[PDB]
PDB file of all heavy atoms in Angstrom:
ATOM      1  N   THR B   1      -0.295  -4.296 -12.136  1.00 20.12           N
ATOM      2  CA  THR B   1      -0.115  -3.243 -11.147  1.00 20.12           C
ATOM      3  C   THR B   1      -1.447  -2.540 -10.909  1.00 20.12           C
ATOM      4  O   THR B   1      -2.099  -2.100 -11.861  1.00 20.12           O
ATOM      5  CB  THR B   1       0.945  -2.239 -11.600  1.00 20.12           C
ATOM      6  OG1 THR B   1       2.211  -2.899 -11.718  1.00 20.12           O
ATOM      7  CG2 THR B   1       1.059  -1.098 -10.606  1.00 20.12           C
ATOM      8  N   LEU B   2      -1.839  -2.436  -9.642  1.00 17.82           N
ATOM      9  CA  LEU B   2      -3.047  -1.735  -9.233  1.00 17.82           C
ATOM     10  C   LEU B   2      -2.687  -0.459  -8.486  1.00 17.82           C
ATOM     11  O   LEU B   2      -1.699  -0.407  -7.752  1.00 17.82           O
ATOM     12  CB  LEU B   2      -3.917  -2.611  -8.332  1.00 17.82           C
ATOM     13  CG  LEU B   2      -4.552  -3.869  -8.915  1.00 17.82           C
ATOM     14  CD1 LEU B   2      -5.462  -4.471  -7.862  1.00 17.82           C
ATOM     15  CD2 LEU B   2      -5.321  -3.574 -10.194  1.00 17.82           C
ATOM     16  N   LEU B   3      -3.516   0.565  -8.666  1.00 16.26           N
ATOM     17  CA  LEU B   3      -3.348   1.857  -8.016  1.00 16.26           C
ATOM     18  C   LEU B   3      -4.422   2.024  -6.949  1.00 16.26           C
ATOM     19  O   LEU B   3      -5.606   1.792  -7.216  1.00 16.26           O
ATOM     20  CB  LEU B   3      -3.427   2.990  -9.042  1.00 16.26           C
ATOM     21  CG  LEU B   3      -2.147   3.255  -9.838  1.00 16.26           C
ATOM     22  CD1 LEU B   3      -1.781   2.081 -10.723  1.00 16.26           C
ATOM     23  CD2 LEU B   3      -2.307   4.508 -10.680  1.00 16.26           C
ATOM     24  N   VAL B   4      -4.007   2.416  -5.744  1.00 14.05           N
ATOM     25  CA  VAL B   4      -4.902   2.525  -4.598  1.00 14.05           C
ATOM     26  C   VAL B   4      -4.567   3.785  -3.817  1.00 14.05           C
ATOM     27  O   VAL B   4      -3.461   3.912  -3.279  1.00 14.05           O
ATOM     28  CB  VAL B   4      -4.809   1.293  -3.675  1.00 14.05           C
ATOM     29  CG1 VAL B   4      -5.834   1.393  -2.557  1.00 14.05           C
ATOM     30  CG2 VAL B   4      -5.005   0.010  -4.464  1.00 14.05           C
ATOM     31  N   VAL B   5      -5.519   4.710  -3.751  1.00 17.66           N
ATOM     32  CA  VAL B   5      -5.433   5.841  -2.835  1.00 17.66           C
ATOM     33  C   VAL B   5      -5.605   5.328  -1.411  1.00 17.66           C
ATOM     34  O   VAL B   5      -6.467   4.482  -1.143  1.00 17.66           O
ATOM     35  CB  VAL B   5      -6.491   6.902  -3.177  1.00 17.66           C
ATOM     36  CG1 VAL B   5      -6.420   8.063  -2.197  1.00 17.66           C
ATOM     37  CG2 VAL B   5      -6.294   7.404  -4.596  1.00 17.66           C
ATOM     38  N   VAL B   6      -4.782   5.835  -0.498  1.00 19.36           N
ATOM     39  CA  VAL B   6      -4.747   5.357   0.882  1.00 19.36           C
ATOM     40  C   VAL B   6      -4.655   6.561   1.817  1.00 19.36           C
ATOM     41  O   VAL B   6      -3.816   7.439   1.585  1.00 19.36           O
ATOM     42  CB  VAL B   6      -3.563   4.403   1.099  1.00 19.36           C
ATOM     43  CG1 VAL B   6      -3.330   4.179   2.577  1.00 19.36           C
ATOM     44  CG2 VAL B   6      -3.800   3.086   0.376  1.00 19.36           C
ATOM     45  N   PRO B   7      -5.452   6.654   2.885  1.00 18.37           N
ATOM     46  CA  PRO B   7      -5.319   7.810   3.781  1.00 18.37           C
ATOM     47  C   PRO B   7      -3.936   7.872   4.413  1.00 18.37           C
ATOM     48  O   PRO B   7      -3.253   6.857   4.570  1.00 18.37           O
ATOM     49  CB  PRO B   7      -6.404   7.573   4.838  1.00 18.37           C
ATOM     50  CG  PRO B   7      -7.369   6.654   4.204  1.00 18.37           C
ATOM     51  CD  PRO B   7      -6.574   5.786   3.286  1.00 18.37           C
ATOM     52  N   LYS B   8      -3.510   9.094   4.747  1.00 18.36           N
ATOM     53  CA  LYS B   8      -2.252   9.254   5.467  1.00 18.36           C
ATOM     54  C   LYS B   8      -2.297   8.546   6.813  1.00 18.36           C
ATOM     55  O   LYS B   8      -1.304   7.941   7.232  1.00 18.36           O
ATOM     56  CB  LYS B   8      -1.932  10.734   5.672  1.00 18.36           C
ATOM     57  CG  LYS B   8      -1.687  11.505   4.392  1.00 18.36           C
ATOM     58  CD  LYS B   8      -1.038  12.849   4.667  1.00 18.36           C
ATOM     59  CE  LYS B   8      -0.640  13.539   3.374  1.00 18.36           C
ATOM     60  NZ  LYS B   8       0.474  12.827   2.687  1.00 18.36           N
ATOM     61  N   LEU B   9      -3.439   8.611   7.499  1.00 18.28           N
ATOM     62  CA  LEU B   9      -3.607   7.943   8.782  1.00 18.28           C
ATOM     63  C   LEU B   9      -3.522   6.427   8.668  1.00 18.28           C
ATOM     64  O   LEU B   9      -3.311   5.758   9.685  1.00 18.28           O
ATOM     65  CB  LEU B   9      -4.951   8.336   9.397  1.00 18.28           C
ATOM     66  CG  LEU B   9      -5.018   9.721  10.047  1.00 18.28           C
ATOM     67  CD1 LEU B   9      -5.001  10.827   8.999  1.00 18.28           C
ATOM     68  CD2 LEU B   9      -6.257   9.834  10.916  1.00 18.28           C
ATOM     69  N   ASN B  10      -3.688   5.876   7.462  1.00 14.72           N
ATOM     70  CA  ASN B  10      -3.575   4.442   7.221  1.00 14.72           C
ATOM     71  C   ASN B  10      -2.606   4.134   6.083  1.00 14.72           C
ATOM     72  O   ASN B  10      -2.851   3.207   5.306  1.00 14.72           O
ATOM     73  CB  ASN B  10      -4.949   3.842   6.913  1.00 14.72           C
ATOM     74  CG  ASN B  10      -5.930   4.015   8.052  1.00 14.72           C
ATOM     75  OD1 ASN B  10      -6.834   4.848   7.986  1.00 14.72           O
ATOM     76  ND2 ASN B  10      -5.769   3.216   9.098  1.00 14.72           N
ATOM     77  N   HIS B  11      -1.518   4.899   5.959  1.00 12.33           N
ATOM     78  CA  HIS B  11      -0.518   4.600   4.938  1.00 12.33           C
ATOM     79  C   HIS B  11       0.391   3.465   5.388  1.00 12.33           C
ATOM     80  O   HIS B  11       0.516   2.443   4.704  1.00 12.33           O
ATOM     81  CB  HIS B  11       0.300   5.851   4.620  1.00 12.33           C
ATOM     82  CG  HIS B  11       1.279   5.665   3.502  1.00 12.33           C
ATOM     83  ND1 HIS B  11       2.436   6.405   3.394  1.00 12.33           N
ATOM     84  CD2 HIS B  11       1.267   4.829   2.436  1.00 12.33           C
ATOM     85  CE1 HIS B  11       3.098   6.030   2.314  1.00 12.33           C
ATOM     86  NE2 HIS B  11       2.409   5.076   1.713  1.00 12.33           N
ATOM     87  N   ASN B  12       1.045   3.633   6.539  1.00 12.84           N
ATOM     88  CA  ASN B  12       1.837   2.545   7.102  1.00 12.84           C
ATOM     89  C   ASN B  12       0.975   1.320   7.385  1.00 12.84           C
ATOM     90  O   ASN B  12       1.451   0.185   7.268  1.00 12.84           O
ATOM     91  CB  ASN B  12       2.550   3.014   8.374  1.00 12.84           C
ATOM     92  CG  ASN B  12       1.613   3.684   9.370  1.00 12.84           C
ATOM     93  OD1 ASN B  12       0.596   3.118   9.769  1.00 12.84           O
ATOM     94  ND2 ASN B  12       1.953   4.904   9.767  1.00 12.84           N
ATOM     95  N   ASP B  13      -0.292   1.528   7.745  1.00 12.75           N
ATOM     96  CA  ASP B  13      -1.194   0.400   7.943  1.00 12.75           C
ATOM     97  C   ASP B  13      -1.428  -0.345   6.636  1.00 12.75           C
ATOM     98  O   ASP B  13      -1.441  -1.580   6.601  1.00 12.75           O
ATOM     99  CB  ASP B  13      -2.511   0.891   8.540  1.00 12.75           C
ATOM    100  CG  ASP B  13      -2.324   1.528   9.901  1.00 12.75           C
ATOM    101  OD1 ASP B  13      -1.389   1.122  10.622  1.00 12.75           O
ATOM    102  OD2 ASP B  13      -3.102   2.439  10.250  1.00 12.75           O
ATOM    103  N   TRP B  14      -1.592   0.388   5.537  1.00 13.95           N
ATOM    104  CA  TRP B  14      -1.735  -0.280   4.252  1.00 13.95           C
ATOM    105  C   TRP B  14      -0.450  -1.000   3.873  1.00 13.95           C
ATOM    106  O   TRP B  14      -0.493  -2.087   3.294  1.00 13.95           O
ATOM    107  CB  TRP B  14      -2.115   0.718   3.166  1.00 13.95           C
ATOM    108  CG  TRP B  14      -2.135   0.101   1.814  1.00 13.95           C
ATOM    109  CD1 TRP B  14      -3.123  -0.672   1.277  1.00 13.95           C
ATOM    110  CD2 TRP B  14      -1.106   0.181   0.826  1.00 13.95           C
ATOM    111  NE1 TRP B  14      -2.777  -1.068   0.008  1.00 13.95           N
ATOM    112  CE2 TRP B  14      -1.541  -0.557  -0.291  1.00 13.95           C
ATOM    113  CE3 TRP B  14       0.141   0.810   0.775  1.00 13.95           C
ATOM    114  CZ2 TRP B  14      -0.775  -0.680  -1.444  1.00 13.95           C
ATOM    115  CZ3 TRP B  14       0.899   0.685  -0.368  1.00 13.95           C
ATOM    116  CH2 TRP B  14       0.440  -0.053  -1.462  1.00 13.95           C
ATOM    117  N   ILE B  15       0.702  -0.406   4.179  1.00 12.94           N
ATOM    118  CA  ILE B  15       1.968  -1.045   3.832  1.00 12.94           C
ATOM    119  C   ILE B  15       2.144  -2.345   4.610  1.00 12.94           C
ATOM    120  O   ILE B  15       2.618  -3.348   4.063  1.00 12.94           O
ATOM    121  CB  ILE B  15       3.144  -0.079   4.063  1.00 12.94           C
ATOM    122  CG1 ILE B  15       3.045   1.114   3.106  1.00 12.94           C
ATOM    123  CG2 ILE B  15       4.471  -0.810   3.882  1.00 12.94           C
ATOM    124  CD1 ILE B  15       3.947   2.277   3.466  1.00 12.94           C
ATOM    125  N   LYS B  16       1.782  -2.353   5.893  1.00 12.31           N
ATOM    126  CA  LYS B  16       1.898  -3.583   6.668  1.00 12.31           C
ATOM    127  C   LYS B  16       0.798  -4.584   6.337  1.00 12.31           C
ATOM    128  O   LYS B  16       0.956  -5.772   6.639  1.00 12.31           O
ATOM    129  CB  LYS B  16       1.882  -3.285   8.174  1.00 12.31           C
ATOM    130  CG  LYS B  16       0.509  -2.983   8.744  1.00 12.31           C
ATOM    131  CD  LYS B  16       0.554  -2.509  10.183  1.00 12.31           C
ATOM    132  CE  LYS B  16      -0.856  -2.387  10.752  1.00 12.31           C
ATOM    133  NZ  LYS B  16      -0.872  -1.814  12.126  1.00 12.31           N
ATOM    134  N   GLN B  17      -0.306  -4.141   5.727  1.00 12.42           N
ATOM    135  CA  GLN B  17      -1.435  -5.023   5.462  1.00 12.42           C
ATOM    136  C   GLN B  17      -1.516  -5.536   4.027  1.00 12.42           C
ATOM    137  O   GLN B  17      -2.207  -6.529   3.796  1.00 12.42           O
ATOM    138  CB  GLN B  17      -2.750  -4.304   5.797  1.00 12.42           C
ATOM    139  CG  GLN B  17      -3.049  -4.211   7.286  1.00 12.42           C
ATOM    140  CD  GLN B  17      -4.247  -3.330   7.587  1.00 12.42           C
ATOM    141  OE1 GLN B  17      -4.759  -2.637   6.709  1.00 12.42           O
ATOM    142  NE2 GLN B  17      -4.701  -3.355   8.835  1.00 12.42           N
ATOM    143  N   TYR B  18      -0.846  -4.901   3.060  1.00 14.12           N
ATOM    144  CA  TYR B  18      -1.128  -5.220   1.662  1.00 14.12           C
ATOM    145  C   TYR B  18      -0.673  -6.628   1.302  1.00 14.12           C
ATOM    146  O   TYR B  18      -1.264  -7.267   0.424  1.00 14.12           O
ATOM    147  CB  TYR B  18      -0.483  -4.191   0.729  1.00 14.12           C
ATOM    148  CG  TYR B  18       0.924  -4.515   0.288  1.00 14.12           C
ATOM    149  CD1 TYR B  18       1.166  -5.121  -0.939  1.00 14.12           C
ATOM    150  CD2 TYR B  18       2.012  -4.196   1.084  1.00 14.12           C
ATOM    151  CE1 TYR B  18       2.448  -5.412  -1.352  1.00 14.12           C
ATOM    152  CE2 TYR B  18       3.300  -4.481   0.679  1.00 14.12           C
ATOM    153  CZ  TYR B  18       3.513  -5.090  -0.538  1.00 14.12           C
ATOM    154  OH  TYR B  18       4.791  -5.377  -0.950  1.00 14.12           O
ATOM    155  N   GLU B  19       0.377  -7.129   1.954  1.00 16.19           N
ATOM    156  CA  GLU B  19       0.773  -8.511   1.708  1.00 16.19           C
ATOM    157  C   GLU B  19      -0.311  -9.479   2.160  1.00 16.19           C
ATOM    158  O   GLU B  19      -0.505 -10.530   1.536  1.00 16.19           O
ATOM    159  CB  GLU B  19       2.096  -8.817   2.410  1.00 16.19           C
ATOM    160  CG  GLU B  19       3.253  -7.959   1.927  1.00 16.19           C
ATOM    161  CD  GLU B  19       4.492  -8.119   2.779  1.00 16.19           C
ATOM    162  OE1 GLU B  19       4.557  -9.090   3.561  1.00 16.19           O
ATOM    163  OE2 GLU B  19       5.402  -7.273   2.664  1.00 16.19           O
ATOM    164  N   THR B  20      -1.026  -9.144   3.232  1.00 14.18           N
ATOM    165  CA  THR B  20      -2.145  -9.946   3.707  1.00 14.18           C
ATOM    166  C   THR B  20      -3.450  -9.646   2.980  1.00 14.18           C
ATOM    167  O   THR B  20      -4.392 -10.438   3.080  1.00 14.18           O
ATOM    168  CB  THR B  20      -2.352  -9.726   5.212  1.00 14.18           C
ATOM    169  OG1 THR B  20      -2.989  -8.462   5.434  1.00 14.18           O
ATOM    170  CG2 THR B  20      -1.019  -9.754   5.951  1.00 14.18           C
ATOM    171  N   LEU B  21      -3.527  -8.530   2.251  1.00 13.65           N
ATOM    172  CA  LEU B  21      -4.763  -8.156   1.573  1.00 13.65           C
ATOM    173  C   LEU B  21      -5.102  -9.100   0.428  1.00 13.65           C
ATOM    174  O   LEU B  21      -6.245  -9.094  -0.041  1.00 13.65           O
ATOM    175  CB  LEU B  21      -4.665  -6.723   1.034  1.00 13.65           C
ATOM    176  CG  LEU B  21      -4.866  -5.526   1.976  1.00 13.65           C
ATOM    177  CD1 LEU B  21      -4.867  -4.234   1.169  1.00 13.65           C
ATOM    178  CD2 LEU B  21      -6.144  -5.623   2.789  1.00 13.65           C
ATOM    179  N   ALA B  22      -4.145  -9.896  -0.040  1.00 12.42           N
ATOM    180  CA  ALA B  22      -4.424 -10.843  -1.108  1.00 12.42           C
ATOM    181  C   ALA B  22      -3.324 -11.892  -1.161  1.00 12.42           C
ATOM    182  O   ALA B  22      -2.221 -11.694  -0.645  1.00 12.42           O
ATOM    183  CB  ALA B  22      -4.561 -10.132  -2.456  1.00 12.42           C
ATOM    184  N   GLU B  23      -3.649 -13.013  -1.796  1.00 10.97           N
ATOM    185  CA  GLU B  23      -2.711 -14.106  -1.990  1.00 10.97           C
ATOM    186  C   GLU B  23      -2.057 -13.996  -3.363  1.00 10.97           C
ATOM    187  O   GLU B  23      -2.527 -13.277  -4.250  1.00 10.97           O
ATOM    188  CB  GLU B  23      -3.423 -15.450  -1.848  1.00 10.97           C
ATOM    189  CG  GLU B  23      -4.060 -15.674  -0.492  1.00 10.97           C
ATOM    190  CD  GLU B  23      -4.701 -17.040  -0.375  1.00 10.97           C
ATOM    191  OE1 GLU B  23      -4.327 -17.940  -1.155  1.00 10.97           O
ATOM    192  OE2 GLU B  23      -5.583 -17.213   0.492  1.00 10.97           O
ATOM    193  N   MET B  24      -0.960 -14.731  -3.537  1.00 12.84           N
ATOM    194  CA  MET B  24      -0.185 -14.685  -4.775  1.00 12.84           C
ATOM    195  C   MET B  24       0.265 -13.254  -5.066  1.00 12.84           C
ATOM    196  O   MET B  24       0.328 -12.818  -6.217  1.00 12.84           O
ATOM    197  CB  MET B  24      -0.995 -15.268  -5.939  1.00 12.84           C
ATOM    198  CG  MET B  24      -0.206 -15.610  -7.212  1.00 12.84           C
ATOM    199  SD  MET B  24       1.216 -16.687  -6.957  1.00 12.84           S
ATOM    200  CE  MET B  24       1.318 -17.511  -8.544  1.00 12.84           C
ATOM    201  N   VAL B  25       0.579 -12.522  -4.004  1.00 10.92           N
ATOM    202  CA  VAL B  25       1.034 -11.149  -4.104  1.00 10.92           C
ATOM    203  C   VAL B  25       2.557 -11.141  -4.041  1.00 10.92           C
ATOM    204  O   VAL B  25       3.191 -12.136  -3.699  1.00 10.92           O
ATOM    205  CB  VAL B  25       0.424 -10.246  -2.994  1.00 10.92           C
ATOM    206  CG1 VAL B  25      -1.103 -10.234  -3.069  1.00 10.92           C
ATOM    207  CG2 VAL B  25       0.900 -10.673  -1.604  1.00 10.92           C
ATOM    208  N   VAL B  26       3.156 -10.004  -4.382  1.00 13.50           N
ATOM    209  CA  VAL B  26       4.608  -9.849  -4.388  1.00 13.50           C
ATOM    210  C   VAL B  26       4.984  -8.973  -3.195  1.00 13.50           C
ATOM    211  O   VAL B  26       4.783  -7.749  -3.255  1.00 13.50           O
ATOM    212  CB  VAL B  26       5.101  -9.231  -5.704  1.00 13.50           C
ATOM    213  CG1 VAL B  26       6.625  -9.190  -5.743  1.00 13.50           C
ATOM    214  CG2 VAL B  26       4.557 -10.005  -6.895  1.00 13.50           C
ATOM    215  N   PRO B  27       5.509  -9.537  -2.107  1.00 16.13           N
ATOM    216  CA  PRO B  27       6.061  -8.690  -1.044  1.00 16.13           C
ATOM    217  C   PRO B  27       7.193  -7.813  -1.559  1.00 16.13           C
ATOM    218  O   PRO B  27       7.944  -8.191  -2.461  1.00 16.13           O
ATOM    219  CB  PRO B  27       6.560  -9.702  -0.009  1.00 16.13           C
ATOM    220  CG  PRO B  27       5.664 -10.867  -0.182  1.00 16.13           C
ATOM    221  CD  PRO B  27       5.326 -10.927  -1.650  1.00 16.13           C
ATOM    222  N   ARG B  28       7.294  -6.621  -0.977  1.00 15.20           N
ATOM    223  CA  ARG B  28       8.269  -5.589  -1.325  1.00 15.20           C
ATOM    224  C   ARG B  28       8.096  -5.051  -2.739  1.00 15.20           C
ATOM    225  O   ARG B  28       9.008  -4.394  -3.256  1.00 15.20           O
ATOM    226  CB  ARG B  28       9.709  -6.085  -1.144  1.00 15.20           C
ATOM    227  CG  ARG B  28      10.041  -6.485   0.284  1.00 15.20           C
ATOM    228  CD  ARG B  28      11.506  -6.848   0.444  1.00 15.20           C
ATOM    229  NE  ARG B  28      12.387  -5.735   0.119  1.00 15.20           N
ATOM    230  CZ  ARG B  28      13.709  -5.825   0.017  1.00 15.20           C
ATOM    231  NH1 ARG B  28      14.345  -6.970   0.210  1.00 15.20           N
ATOM    232  NH2 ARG B  28      14.411  -4.738  -0.289  1.00 15.20           N
ATOM    233  N   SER B  29       6.958  -5.307  -3.387  1.00 12.93           N
ATOM    234  CA  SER B  29       6.624  -4.638  -4.637  1.00 12.93           C
ATOM    235  C   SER B  29       5.825  -3.362  -4.418  1.00 12.93           C
ATOM    236  O   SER B  29       5.583  -2.630  -5.383  1.00 12.93           O
ATOM    237  CB  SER B  29       5.830  -5.576  -5.548  1.00 12.93           C
ATOM    238  OG  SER B  29       4.519  -5.777  -5.053  1.00 12.93           O
ATOM    239  N   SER B  30       5.410  -3.083  -3.186  1.00 12.43           N
ATOM    240  CA  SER B  30       4.676  -1.861  -2.905  1.00 12.43           C
ATOM    241  C   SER B  30       5.584  -0.648  -3.061  1.00 12.43           C
ATOM    242  O   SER B  30       6.796  -0.713  -2.843  1.00 12.43           O
ATOM    243  CB  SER B  30       4.092  -1.899  -1.494  1.00 12.43           C
ATOM    244  OG  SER B  30       3.737  -0.600  -1.054  1.00 12.43           O
ATOM    245  N   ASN B  31       4.980   0.470  -3.454  1.00 13.50           N
ATOM    246  CA  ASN B  31       5.715   1.713  -3.628  1.00 13.50           C
ATOM    247  C   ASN B  31       4.747   2.879  -3.515  1.00 13.50           C
ATOM    248  O   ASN B  31       3.533   2.708  -3.651  1.00 13.50           O
ATOM    249  CB  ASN B  31       6.438   1.747  -4.977  1.00 13.50           C
ATOM    250  CG  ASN B  31       5.488   1.599  -6.145  1.00 13.50           C
ATOM    251  OD1 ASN B  31       4.988   2.587  -6.685  1.00 13.50           O
ATOM    252  ND2 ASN B  31       5.230   0.358  -6.544  1.00 13.50           N
ATOM    253  N   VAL B  32       5.298   4.063  -3.263  1.00 12.17           N
ATOM    254  CA  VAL B  32       4.511   5.289  -3.180  1.00 12.17           C
ATOM    255  C   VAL B  32       4.700   6.024  -4.503  1.00 12.17           C
ATOM    256  O   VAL B  32       5.676   6.751  -4.693  1.00 12.17           O
ATOM    257  CB  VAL B  32       4.922   6.148  -1.983  1.00 12.17           C
ATOM    258  CG1 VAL B  32       4.061   7.402  -1.907  1.00 12.17           C
ATOM    259  CG2 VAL B  32       4.817   5.344  -0.693  1.00 12.17           C
ATOM    260  N   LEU B  33       3.759   5.822  -5.428  1.00 11.96           N
ATOM    261  CA  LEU B  33       3.847   6.466  -6.735  1.00 11.96           C
ATOM    262  C   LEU B  33       3.830   7.984  -6.601  1.00 11.96           C
ATOM    263  O   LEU B  33       4.640   8.685  -7.219  1.00 11.96           O
ATOM    264  CB  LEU B  33       2.694   5.990  -7.622  1.00 11.96           C
ATOM    265  CG  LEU B  33       2.357   6.815  -8.869  1.00 11.96           C
ATOM    266  CD1 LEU B  33       3.539   6.889  -9.826  1.00 11.96           C
ATOM    267  CD2 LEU B  33       1.145   6.228  -9.566  1.00 11.96           C
ATOM    268  N   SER B  34       2.913   8.505  -5.794  1.00 12.72           N
ATOM    269  CA  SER B  34       2.717   9.942  -5.646  1.00 12.72           C
ATOM    270  C   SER B  34       2.030  10.187  -4.308  1.00 12.72           C
ATOM    271  O   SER B  34       1.712   9.250  -3.571  1.00 12.72           O
ATOM    272  CB  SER B  34       1.904  10.504  -6.820  1.00 12.72           C
ATOM    273  OG  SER B  34       1.795  11.916  -6.755  1.00 12.72           O
ATOM    274  N   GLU B  35       1.810  11.460  -3.991  1.00 14.51           N
ATOM    275  CA  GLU B  35       1.146  11.820  -2.749  1.00 14.51           C
ATOM    276  C   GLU B  35       0.452  13.163  -2.914  1.00 14.51           C
ATOM    277  O   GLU B  35       0.656  13.882  -3.895  1.00 14.51           O
ATOM    278  CB  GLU B  35       2.136  11.860  -1.579  1.00 14.51           C
ATOM    279  CG  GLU B  35       3.118  13.023  -1.625  1.00 14.51           C
ATOM    280  CD  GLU B  35       4.182  12.927  -0.551  1.00 14.51           C
ATOM    281  OE1 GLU B  35       4.563  11.794  -0.189  1.00 14.51           O
ATOM    282  OE2 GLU B  35       4.633  13.985  -0.067  1.00 14.51           O
ATOM    283  N   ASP B  36      -0.381  13.488  -1.930  1.00 18.06           N
ATOM    284  CA  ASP B  36      -1.088  14.756  -1.866  1.00 18.06           C
ATOM    285  C   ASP B  36      -1.139  15.169  -0.399  1.00 18.06           C
ATOM    286  O   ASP B  36      -0.424  14.617   0.443  1.00 18.06           O
ATOM    287  CB  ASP B  36      -2.483  14.632  -2.498  1.00 18.06           C
ATOM    288  CG  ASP B  36      -2.955  15.924  -3.152  1.00 18.06           C
ATOM    289  OD1 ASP B  36      -2.271  16.959  -3.015  1.00 18.06           O
ATOM    290  OD2 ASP B  36      -4.019  15.902  -3.806  1.00 18.06           O
ATOM    291  N   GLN B  37      -1.990  16.143  -0.083  1.00 17.01           N
ATOM    292  CA  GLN B  37      -2.116  16.605   1.293  1.00 17.01           C
ATOM    293  C   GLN B  37      -3.030  15.725   2.137  1.00 17.01           C
ATOM    294  O   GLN B  37      -3.182  15.997   3.332  1.00 17.01           O
ATOM    295  CB  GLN B  37      -2.612  18.062   1.321  1.00 17.01           C
ATOM    296  CG  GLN B  37      -4.107  18.299   1.007  1.00 17.01           C
ATOM    297  CD  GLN B  37      -4.404  18.393  -0.479  1.00 17.01           C
ATOM    298  OE1 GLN B  37      -3.505  18.580  -1.298  1.00 17.01           O
ATOM    299  NE2 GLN B  37      -5.677  18.256  -0.833  1.00 17.01           N
TER     300      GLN B  37
END
């Protein structure tokens, strides 16, 4: 499991892109551990 801070302006973008960000990845394993402002 890797932890990645992601801008709010690119949160949904990261969610739609993370499956393409690497191979041998687990789709639907993404989650929002925490958040800030």
Side-chain angles (χ1 to χ4, degrees):
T1 297
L2 294 185
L3 279 65
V4 185
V5 179
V6 166
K8 296 195 173 292
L9 283 72
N10 299 105
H11 185 207
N12 51 54
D13 298 330
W14 174 79
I15 295 166
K16 77 188 187 185
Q17 284 172 350
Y18 90 97
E19 299 171 15
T20 76
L21 281 186
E23 300 182 21
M24 195 54 152
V25 301
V26 185
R28 299 185 61 189
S29 71
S30 162
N31 59 91
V32 181
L33 163 60
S34 185
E35 71 187 32
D36 212 353
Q37 75 275 344

